[PDB]
Amino acid sequence: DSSRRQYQEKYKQVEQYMSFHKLPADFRQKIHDYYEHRYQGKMFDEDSILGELNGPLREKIVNFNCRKLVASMPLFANADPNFVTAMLTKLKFEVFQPGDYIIREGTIGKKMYFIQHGVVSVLTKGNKEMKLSDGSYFGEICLLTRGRRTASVRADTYCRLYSLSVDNFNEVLEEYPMMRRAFETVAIDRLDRI
Amino acid sequence: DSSRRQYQEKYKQVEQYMSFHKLPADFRQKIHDYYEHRYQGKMFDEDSILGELNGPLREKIVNFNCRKLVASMPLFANADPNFVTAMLTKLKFEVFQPGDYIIREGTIGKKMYFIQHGVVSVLTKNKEMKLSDGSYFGEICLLTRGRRTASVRADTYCRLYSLSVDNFNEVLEEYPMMRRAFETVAIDRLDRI
Amino acid sequence: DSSRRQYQEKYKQVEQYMSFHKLPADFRQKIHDYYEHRYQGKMFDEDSILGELNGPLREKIVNFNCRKLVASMPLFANADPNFVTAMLTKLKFEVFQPGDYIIREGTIGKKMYFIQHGVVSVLTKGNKEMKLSDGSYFGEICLLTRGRRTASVRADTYCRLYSLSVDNFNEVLEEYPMMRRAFETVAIDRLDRI
Amino acid sequence: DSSRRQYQEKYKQVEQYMSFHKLPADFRQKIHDYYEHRYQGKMFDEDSILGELNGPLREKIVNFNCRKLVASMPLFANADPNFVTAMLTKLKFEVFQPGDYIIREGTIGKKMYFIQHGVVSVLTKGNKEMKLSDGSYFGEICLLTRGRRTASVRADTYCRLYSLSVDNFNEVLEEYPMMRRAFETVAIDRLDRI
Numbered sequence: 001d002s003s004r005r006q007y008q009e010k011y012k013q014v015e016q017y018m019s020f021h022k023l024p025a026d027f028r029q030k031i032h033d034y035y036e037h038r039y040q041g042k043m044f045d046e047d048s049i050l051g052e053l054n055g056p057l058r059e060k061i062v063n064f065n066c067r068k069l070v071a072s073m074p075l076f077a078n079a080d081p082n083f084v085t086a087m088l089t090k091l092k093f094e095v096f097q098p099g100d101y102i103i104r105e106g107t108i109g110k111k112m113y114f115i116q117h118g119v120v121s122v123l124t125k126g127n128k129e130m131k132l133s134d135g136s137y138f139g140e141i142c143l144l145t146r147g148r149r150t151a152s153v154r155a156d157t158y159c160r161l162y163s164l165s166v167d168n169f170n171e172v173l174e175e176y177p178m179m180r181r182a183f184e185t186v187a188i189d190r191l192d193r194i
Numbered sequence: 195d196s197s198r199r200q201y202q203e204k205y206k207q208v209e210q211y212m213s214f215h216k217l218p219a220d221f222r223q224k225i226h227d228y229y230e231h232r233y234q235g236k237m238f239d240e241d242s243i244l245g246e247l248n249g250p251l252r253e254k255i256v257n258f259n260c261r262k263l264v265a266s267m268p269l270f271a272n273a274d275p276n277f278v279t280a281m282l283t284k285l286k287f288e289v290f291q292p293g294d295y296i297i298r299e300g301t302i303g304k305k306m307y308f309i310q311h312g313v314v315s316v317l318t319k320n321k322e323m324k325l326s327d328g329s330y331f332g333e334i335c336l337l338t339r340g341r342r343t344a345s346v347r348a349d350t351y352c353r354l355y356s357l358s359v360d361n362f363n364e365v366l367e368e369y370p371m372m373r374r375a376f377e378t379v380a381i382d383r384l385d386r387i
Numbered sequence: 388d389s390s391r392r393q394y395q396e397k398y399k400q401v402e403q404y405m406s407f408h409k410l411p412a413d414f415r416q417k418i419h420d421y422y423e424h425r426y427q428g429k430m431f432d433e434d435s436i437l438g439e440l441n442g443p444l445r446e447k448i449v450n451f452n453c454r455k456l457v458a459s460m461p462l463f464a465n466a467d468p469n470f471v472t473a474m475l476t477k478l479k480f481e482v483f484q485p486g487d488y489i490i491r492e493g494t495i496g497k498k499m500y501f502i503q504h505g506v507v508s509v510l511t512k513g514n515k516e517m518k519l520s521d522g523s524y525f526g527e528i529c530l531l532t533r534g535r536r537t538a539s540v541r542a543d544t545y546c547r548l549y550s551l552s553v554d555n556f557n558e559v560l561e562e563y564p565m566m567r568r569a570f571e572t573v574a575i576d577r578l579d580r581i
Numbered sequence: 582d583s584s585r586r587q588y589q590e591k592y593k594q595v596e597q598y599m600s601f602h603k604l605p606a607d608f609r610q611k612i613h614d615y616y617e618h619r620y621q622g623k624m625f626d627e628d629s630i631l632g633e634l635n636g637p638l639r640e641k642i643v644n645f646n647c648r649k650l651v652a653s654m655p656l657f658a659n660a661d662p663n664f665v666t667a668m669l670t671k672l673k674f675e676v677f678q679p680g681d682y683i684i685r686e687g688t689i690g691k692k693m694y695f696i697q698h699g700v701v702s703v704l705t706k707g708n709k710e711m712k713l714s715d716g717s718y719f720g721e722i723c724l725l726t727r728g729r730r731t732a733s734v735r736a737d738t739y740c741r742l743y744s745l746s747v748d749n750f751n752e753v754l755e756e757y758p759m760m761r762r763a764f765e766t767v768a769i770d771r772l773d774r775i
């Protein structure tokens with residue numbers, strides 16, 4: 001079908017791009033593996049498809065695609081369904097590979113991440129490593145402080161995450177301001193542990 | 195024709211997307227029906243076509259496509275034709291299915307809707323009322339910048355034109371006295387609530 | 388040629404669009420003639436092509452294409468060539484058909500127009516009609532005043548124009564502020580005539 | 582071969598555009614030569630490809646493509662690798678042809694350039710010409726002063742450059758403020774020589 005063909009064609013152009021730029025074989029394989037994990041052999045113009053729909057259908061789709069994620073977290077599971085929809089609509093799906101630095105300590109943080117599937121290591125230089133997995137989130141501290149990252153976060157396994165930018169976080173909280181407290185609780189607890 | 199082929203091909207992609215995401219059969223039927231009602235078996239890159247034209251032709255097209263909507267509302271039918279063209283230019287066509295919540299009470303409202311064809315049910319949580327062809331709703335929050343005073347749910351398929359609060363205010367920069375039309379309606383409805 | 392095929396395929400889409408929306412025959416004829424005059428049987432992804440180039444080549448192309456326009460106006464012919472290039476780069480080519488309102492009196496004006504080829508009729512309601520043609524410009528008054536249009540301007544012949552937005556006008560004049568005087572002289576003259 | 586076909590098809594479109602606009606044969610050849618030097622017979626939708634990846638992979642790619650440029654400049658070679666990545670991510674690759682004015686004296690400057698390969702001539706009207714080549718940069722003075730260009734800079738040879746806008750320059754320096762000093766040192770030295 002057309003979506004399988006689109007993946008095969010797009011991947012051929014990626015191979016050619018990597019060849020043109022003389023990328024090493026190991027990195028070429030890393031890109032191969034990334035495409036397999038991220039797109040699973042099919043590609044869609046999701047923006048175009050979703051843009052063809054209406055609000056209700058888009059909201060039904062995002063809620064469906066994120067059912068498990070939502071179930072995982074009391075943040076979403078116990079909230080106003082209109083809040084959950086608002087936040088889910090803003091999320092960006094991202095895949096990271098083992099060893100990737102998702103967050104680097106000391107940098108200016110502008111995104112947080114919700115873990116759909118995978119394990120990450122949180123490492124504050126000089127402190128003990130802590131791990132987070134399915135149904136946890138991280139990177140909230142900088143969304144609240146507008147400061148610098150308090151720890152590095154690396155992918156231990158392949159990680160299927162949803163990211164949320166500070167502007168989108170704040171935009172949603174304009175409508176649901178009391179939900180900020182959920183994130184502050186976590187941030188405070190983590191800052192105490194650090 | 196290329197436009198029918200575009201629909202058929204675009205719809206196949208949508209089927210594959212729904213398959214990939216494992217969406218339930220009933221939802222897939224709902225999406226299929228949406229595409230049939232919204233696009234009627236043809237698809238166009240409207241933005242590209244309109245972008246190829248000039249101002250006069252774009253304005254002629256939007257006026258023609260909306261001529262019935264315009265005749266159906268004193269707002270537009272009795273107004274400066276240049277105001278009508280300015281407002282029509284900002285409208286976005288949207289189709290909603292029976293049961294859809296177009297507006298949810300209590301949310302921050304940033305759009306209003308003009309009913310070209312269809313019936314909606316308006317409810318403040320009491321006693322429902324209905325609006326149909328030639329009515330508009332959602333104006334209150336465009337004026338107040340507050341929260342929705344009622345939920346509005348499609349009873350039939352609804353062919354609507356939406357207008358964002360920013361586009362509303364932009365047009366009213368040039369035609370400020372037209373704001374009164376919307377305020378009259380909002381005041382009347384707030385009194386009824 | 389690919390550009391000729393593009394025109395033919397694009398125009399078939401337009402025909403189908405017009406059919407779908409049930410536009411009257413006379414309107415369809417009008418659209419057909421517009422495509423012929425504006426595109427002359429060929430179409431290019433001009434944005435894409437120019438985006439593939441560099442500054443110097445883009446500037447050479449716009450200067451070449453506007454050679455006659457520039458020669459026709461002391462504004463451009465006598466000016467710093469860097470000013471001319473800056474202004475030309477901002478211009479948008481537009482074609483209008485006989486009878487078209489280019490500007491409507493009393494509306495908020497945000498663009499001016501340079502006449503490459505054609506004749507327009509300038510009319511302030513209640514006043515005498517006058518004509519402008521190749522090498523004239525109009526619509527400058529509102530760029531300077533930020534007020535309402537002082538006259539309507541309608542295409543008499545087919546008009547090949549270049550438009551310039553108020554923001555682009557002001558942007559160029561940030562760098563070449565003394566060039567504002569040229570437009571003011573013309574505006575002052577016309578206001579006195581009105 | 583999809584990328585080679587893309588170049589061949591894209592260039593046919595360019596030839597036809599030039600024919601439509603009646604460009605002289607010498608200019609057409611100049612455009613042909615530019616496409617050969619800039620794209621080298623292959624074209625990619627780089628924005629699309631990079632947009633399909635994640636942060637870590639994009640950063641790996643930009644670091645790889647620029648590693649020699651980085652090696653050549655103490656600015657980058659001795660810096661926090663996170664600063665280098667942040668700056669590299671903002672760079673735009675540009676190719677200029679012999680004789681091109683990259684910078685014109687007295688104009689409002691909004692970009693600087695890093696030389697990957699080529700020779701440029703710097704000339705302040707009335708002063709002695711100076712040359713710069715691989716591993717030098719120029720155009721920094723206006724990014725710091727927000728004033729007018731202190732010299733013209735012309736391509737002596739074909740020049741393969743990376744440009745950086747003033748807004749991107751300042752954005753990166755929000756995170757790495759002390760790195761502004763490197764550019765000020767160079768600017769000061771050059772202003773002294775002028």
Ligand SMILES: Nc1ncnc2c1ncn2[C@@H]1O[C@@H]2COP(=O)(O)O[C@H]2[C@H]1O
Binds near residue numbers: 152
């Ligand atoms: N002790 C901890 N346990 C779990 N997560 C942590 C801990 N310390 C820091 N983090 C997370 O690591 C993230 C690094 O980026 P932020 O500082 O924005 O937000 C931080 C927290 O979400």
Ligand SMILES: Nc1ncnc2c1ncn2[C@@H]1O[C@@H]2COP(=O)(O)O[C@H]2[C@H]1O
Binds near residue numbers: 384
């Ligand atoms: N009694 C009523 N009759 C008709 N429409 C109403 C009534 N009450 C509320 N509405 C509409 O329902 C809309 C809900 O969104 P708004 O509050 O923005 O604007 C409201 C009105 O347009």
Ligand SMILES: Nc1ncnc2c1ncn2[C@@H]1O[C@@H]2COP(=O)(O)O[C@H]2[C@H]1O
Binds near residue numbers: 496509524525526537
């Ligand atoms: N007597 C006149 N002669 C030439 N041009 C005119 C005259 N009166 C008005 N105009 C032009 O018509 C334009 C209408 O839009 P503006 O008022 O922005 O700017 C106006 C002038 O450029």
Ligand SMILES: Nc1ncnc2c1ncn2[C@@H]1O[C@@H]2COP(=O)(O)O[C@H]2[C@H]1O
Binds near residue numbers: 711719721724730
């Ligand atoms: N003597 C010099 N040696 C090297 N580069 C110079 C000299 N004088 C000016 N420049 C460069 O020429 C550039 C022209 O644009 P800027 O003034 O923005 O920044 C200037 C410097 O980067």
